CSV table of C-alpha atoms in Angstrom, one decimal:
chain,number,residue,atom,x,y,z
A,35,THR,CA,170.0,202.9,17.1
A,36,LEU,CA,171.8,200.2,15.8
A,37,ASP,CA,172.3,197.1,18.3
A,38,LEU,CA,175.7,195.8,18.9
A,39,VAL,CA,176.8,192.1,17.6
A,40,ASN,CA,176.6,189.5,20.7
A,41,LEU,CA,179.9,187.6,20.9
A,42,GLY,CA,179.0,185.4,24.1
A,43,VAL,CA,181.9,183.4,24.9
A,44,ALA,CA,183.7,184.2,21.6
A,45,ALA,CA,184.5,187.7,23.3
A,46,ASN,CA,186.7,186.1,25.6
A,47,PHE,CA,189.0,185.6,22.5
A,48,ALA,CA,191.8,187.8,20.4
A,49,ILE,CA,192.2,184.9,17.9
A,50,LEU,CA,189.3,182.2,17.6
A,51,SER,CA,189.3,179.6,14.3
A,52,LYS,CA,187.8,176.2,13.4
A,53,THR,CA,190.4,174.9,11.5
A,54,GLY,CA,193.7,176.4,13.0
A,55,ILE,CA,196.4,179.0,13.4
A,56,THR,CA,199.2,179.4,11.6
A,57,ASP,CA,202.3,181.8,12.2
A,58,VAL,CA,205.4,183.3,10.8
A,59,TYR,CA,207.4,183.9,14.7
A,60,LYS,CA,207.7,186.2,16.0
A,61,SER,CA,203.9,187.4,16.6
A,62,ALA,CA,202.2,189.6,19.6
A,63,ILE,CA,199.0,188.2,20.7
A,64,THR,CA,197.0,189.7,23.8
A,65,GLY,CA,194.2,187.7,24.9
A,66,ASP,CA,193.3,184.0,24.7
A,67,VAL,CA,193.4,181.9,21.1
A,68,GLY,CA,191.7,179.0,20.4
A,69,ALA,CA,190.6,176.5,17.6
A,70,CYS,CA,187.8,174.1,17.1
A,71,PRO,CA,186.8,171.1,16.5
A,72,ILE,CA,190.3,170.6,15.1
A,73,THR,CA,193.3,169.3,17.1
A,74,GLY,CA,195.5,172.0,19.2
A,75,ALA,CA,198.6,170.7,16.8
A,76,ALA,CA,196.6,172.8,14.1
A,77,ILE,CA,198.2,176.0,16.7
A,78,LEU,CA,201.6,177.2,15.4
A,79,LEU,CA,201.9,179.2,17.7
A,80,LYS,CA,204.7,179.2,20.7
A,81,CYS,CA,203.8,180.3,24.1
A,82,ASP,CA,206.3,183.5,24.2
A,83,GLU,CA,203.5,185.0,21.6
A,84,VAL,CA,200.6,184.8,23.6
A,85,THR,CA,199.6,187.0,26.3
A,86,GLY,CA,196.4,184.9,27.7
A,87,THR,CA,195.5,181.3,27.3
A,88,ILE,CA,196.2,178.8,24.1
A,89,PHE,CA,193.0,176.7,24.4
A,90,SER,CA,193.0,173.1,22.9
A,91,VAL,CA,189.9,170.5,22.1
A,92,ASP,CA,192.9,168.1,23.0
A,93,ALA,CA,196.0,166.9,24.4
A,94,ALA,CA,197.9,168.1,21.4
A,95,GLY,CA,199.1,172.1,21.1
A,96,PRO,CA,201.5,174.1,22.3
A,97,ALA,CA,203.4,173.3,25.7
A,98,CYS,CA,201.2,176.0,27.7
A,99,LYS,CA,198.1,174.9,26.4
A,100,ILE,CA,194.6,174.5,28.3
A,101,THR,CA,192.8,171.4,27.0
A,102,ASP,CA,189.4,172.5,27.7
A,103,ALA,CA,187.0,171.2,24.6
A,104,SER,CA,183.6,172.3,26.1
A,105,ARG,CA,184.7,176.0,26.5
A,106,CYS,CA,186.4,176.3,22.5
A,107,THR,CA,183.0,174.6,21.5
A,108,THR,CA,181.0,177.0,23.1
A,109,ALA,CA,182.9,179.8,21.8
A,110,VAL,CA,182.9,178.3,18.3
A,111,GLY,CA,179.0,177.9,18.5
A,112,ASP,CA,178.7,181.7,19.9
A,113,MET,CA,180.7,183.2,16.7
A,114,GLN,CA,178.5,181.1,14.1
A,115,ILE,CA,175.5,183.1,16.3
A,116,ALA,CA,177.2,186.5,16.1
A,117,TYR,CA,178.2,185.7,12.1
A,118,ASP,CA,174.5,185.0,11.2
A,119,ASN,CA,173.0,187.9,13.7
A,120,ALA,CA,175.8,190.4,12.0
A,121,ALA,CA,174.5,188.9,8.5
A,122,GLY,CA,170.9,188.7,9.2
A,123,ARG,CA,170.5,192.3,9.5
A,124,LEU,CA,168.0,194.6,7.4
A,125,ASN,CA,167.6,197.9,6.1
A,126,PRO,CA,171.1,198.8,5.3
A,127,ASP,CA,171.8,202.5,5.8
A,128,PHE,CA,174.7,201.8,2.7
A,129,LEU,CA,174.8,199.7,-0.2
A,130,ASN,CA,178.1,199.4,-2.4
A,131,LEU,CA,179.6,202.5,-0.7
A,132,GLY,CA,182.8,203.8,-3.0
A,133,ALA,CA,181.8,201.0,-5.8
A,134,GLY,CA,183.8,198.2,-3.6
A,135,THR,CA,186.5,200.8,-2.8
A,136,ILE,CA,186.3,203.0,0.0
A,137,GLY,CA,190.4,204.7,0.5
A,138,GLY,CA,189.8,208.3,2.2
A,139,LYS,CA,186.4,208.0,3.5
A,140,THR,CA,185.1,208.4,6.8
A,141,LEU,CA,182.5,206.3,8.1
A,142,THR,CA,179.6,207.5,10.3
A,143,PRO,CA,177.5,204.7,12.5
A,144,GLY,CA,175.2,202.1,10.7
A,145,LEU,CA,174.8,199.1,8.8
A,146,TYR,CA,176.6,198.8,5.8
A,147,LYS,CA,176.7,196.6,2.6
A,148,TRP,CA,178.5,195.4,-0.2
A,149,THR,CA,177.0,192.4,-2.7
A,150,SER,CA,181.0,192.3,-4.2
A,151,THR,CA,184.5,192.6,-2.5
A,152,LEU,CA,185.3,195.1,-0.6
A,153,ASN,CA,188.9,197.0,-0.5
A,154,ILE,CA,190.4,199.4,1.3
A,155,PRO,CA,193.4,200.9,-0.5
A,156,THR,CA,194.1,204.0,1.5
A,157,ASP,CA,193.4,205.4,5.0
A,158,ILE,CA,189.9,205.6,6.3
A,159,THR,CA,188.5,207.0,9.5
A,160,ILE,CA,185.8,205.6,11.3
A,161,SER,CA,184.1,208.6,13.4
A,162,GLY,CA,181.3,208.3,15.7
A,163,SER,CA,180.5,208.5,19.8
A,164,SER,CA,181.5,205.7,22.5
A,165,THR,CA,178.1,204.5,22.2
A,166,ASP,CA,177.9,204.2,18.4
A,167,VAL,CA,178.5,200.6,16.2
A,168,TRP,CA,179.4,199.6,12.8
A,169,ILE,CA,178.4,196.7,10.8
A,170,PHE,CA,180.0,195.9,7.7
A,171,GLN,CA,178.4,193.5,5.8
A,172,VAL,CA,180.5,191.9,3.0
A,173,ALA,CA,179.3,189.4,0.5
A,174,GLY,CA,182.7,188.3,-0.9
A,175,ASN,CA,186.5,189.3,0.4
A,176,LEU,CA,187.8,192.3,2.1
A,177,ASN,CA,191.6,193.4,1.5
A,178,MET,CA,193.2,196.4,2.7
A,179,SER,CA,196.7,197.5,1.3
A,180,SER,CA,200.0,197.4,3.0
A,181,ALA,CA,200.5,200.7,5.5
A,182,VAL,CA,196.9,201.5,5.3
A,183,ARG,CA,195.6,202.8,9.0
A,184,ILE,CA,192.0,202.7,10.1
A,185,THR,CA,192.0,205.7,12.6
A,186,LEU,CA,189.0,205.9,14.8
A,187,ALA,CA,187.6,209.7,15.7
A,188,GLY,CA,185.1,210.9,18.1
A,189,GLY,CA,184.8,208.4,20.8
A,190,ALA,CA,184.6,205.5,18.3
A,191,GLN,CA,185.8,202.4,19.9
A,192,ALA,CA,186.8,199.0,18.3
A,193,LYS,CA,184.8,196.8,20.3
A,194,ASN,CA,181.5,198.2,18.7
A,195,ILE,CA,182.9,197.6,15.1
A,196,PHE,CA,181.8,194.4,13.6
A,197,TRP,CA,182.9,193.3,10.4
A,198,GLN,CA,181.2,190.1,9.0
A,199,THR,CA,182.7,188.6,5.7
A,200,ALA,CA,181.2,185.8,3.3
A,201,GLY,CA,184.5,185.6,2.0
A,202,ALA,CA,188.2,185.7,3.3
A,203,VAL,CA,189.9,188.8,4.9
A,204,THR,CA,193.0,190.1,3.5
A,205,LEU,CA,195.2,192.3,5.9
A,206,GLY,CA,198.1,193.9,4.1
A,207,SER,CA,201.6,194.4,5.2
A,208,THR,CA,202.3,197.1,8.0
A,209,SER,CA,198.5,197.8,7.8
A,210,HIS,CA,196.3,198.8,10.9
A,211,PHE,CA,193.0,197.2,11.7
A,212,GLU,CA,190.3,198.3,14.3
A,213,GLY,CA,187.0,196.2,14.7
A,214,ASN,CA,185.9,192.4,15.2
A,215,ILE,CA,186.2,190.2,12.1
A,216,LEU,CA,183.3,187.9,12.0
A,217,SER,CA,184.9,185.2,8.6
A,218,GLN,CA,182.7,182.9,7.4
A,219,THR,CA,186.3,181.9,6.1
A,220,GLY,CA,189.9,182.7,6.8
A,221,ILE,CA,191.5,185.8,8.4
A,222,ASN,CA,195.1,186.4,6.7
A,223,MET,CA,197.6,188.8,8.1
A,224,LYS,CA,201.2,190.1,6.4
A,225,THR,CA,204.7,190.9,7.6
A,226,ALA,CA,204.0,193.3,10.5
A,227,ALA,CA,200.3,194.2,10.2
A,228,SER,CA,198.6,195.0,13.3
A,229,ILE,CA,194.7,194.9,14.6
A,230,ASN,CA,193.0,195.9,17.5
A,231,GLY,CA,189.9,193.6,17.5
A,232,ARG,CA,189.5,189.8,17.5
A,233,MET,CA,189.7,187.5,14.3
A,234,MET,CA,187.0,184.8,14.5
A,235,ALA,CA,187.2,182.4,11.3
A,236,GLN,CA,185.1,179.9,10.5
A,237,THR,CA,188.0,177.8,8.6
A,238,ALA,CA,191.9,179.4,9.8
A,239,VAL,CA,193.4,182.4,11.0
A,240,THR,CA,197.3,183.1,9.3
A,241,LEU,CA,199.9,185.6,11.0
A,242,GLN,CA,203.1,186.8,9.5
A,243,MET,CA,204.8,188.8,12.7
A,244,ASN,CA,201.9,190.9,13.8
A,245,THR,CA,200.5,192.6,16.9
A,246,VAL,CA,196.8,191.4,17.4
A,247,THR,CA,195.2,193.1,21.0
A,248,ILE,CA,191.7,192.3,22.0
A,249,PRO,CA,189.5,195.4,22.2
A,250,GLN,CA,189.5,197.7,25.6
C-alpha cells in the first residue's frame, strides 16, 4: 500500500545535480546526466564516461554535451517535487531503527524514518516483492562504509527504493548501493563504489572511479 515516489522528468537521469558533478577519471555511468541551474562547465565528466546524453543549461561543458535549458530545469523541478513528496510521507512503519546503525538487517517494505544520521557499516538485505516500495527518510547524513553491499531479495527492485536525506550522502570505497537517492545536499561516492540507482542532489554529486547504472 506504500505509493511510489514520482520522479517525473528526473526519472530519465542517472545523475542530476544543481551545482555540478565532479569526477576522478575513469567512471562508468549508464543513463543521462544533467546539472542546472549551474553552467555545464560544472560537469567534469568526459564523453567516454557516459552511456547516454550529458545535458547543459548553456554552451559550456564536455564536448558531447547537449544544450537544453528547459529539459534540465523541468528535471531539477521534478526532482524537488519528488524530494518534498518523499520527505512529506506520514505514519512511518519504523522510527530510529537500529538507533542509526543498521548493519546486518533485512529491511521489509514500508516507510522508515531516522531523526538522526543513518550509518550502514555492514551488508544489508532489502527483501520484498517486485511491486513492494521502500521509502527511507533520513533527517541527517547517510553513510555506508567501504565494501558494504546492499543485496535485493524476493524480487525487490532498485526502481521501487527511495532514500530521502536532509544531509549529505557518503558511499564508501568499493561499496554497492541500491535505490534512488534524493539528497537535499550532496552525494559523494569513493573509489570503485557502485550504485544501481539514481543520484539526485540539490547541491553536487562527486565521483571517484564509480560504476553508476540507472534502474531497469
